[PDB]
Amino acid sequence: MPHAFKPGDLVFAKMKGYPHWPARIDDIADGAVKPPPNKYPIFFFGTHETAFLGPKDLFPYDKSKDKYGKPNKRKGFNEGLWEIQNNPHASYS
């Protein structure tokens, strides 16, 4: 059975206006800004942007990749697909 989301989990993450996007649940570094309650820090592959999202917008990557893991015209998306498949736990700072 599923657990709660934890840092390192791979997802597609959904935001208004954008296709389901390859992403991971990030850690919060010591001294860094914490997310709001019930929100996770989401790191978007390809764009390397961070947003705070709740589980309603988080789709586990293995279950969803057949649906969501296809190339897209949007800036950063295809680089994002490479990252999530090839080095999803790397430093992208």
Contact set with ligand WO7 (CB under 6 A): 15, 18, 21, 44, 47, 49, 51, 76
- Smallest separation (angstroms) from ligand WO7 to the CB of 76: 6
Question: Where is 84: in which H helix or E strand?
Answer: helix 77-86
Q: Which residues lie closer than 8 Å to 34 by C-beta, 6 or more apart?
A: 28
Closest CB to ligand WO7 among residues 1, 33: 33
Closest CB to ligand WO7 among residues 21, 40: 21
Closest CB to ligand WO7 among residues 79, 85: 79
CA angle 72, 58, 63 (to 5 degrees): 75
Q: Fill in the amino acid letter for 72.
A: N
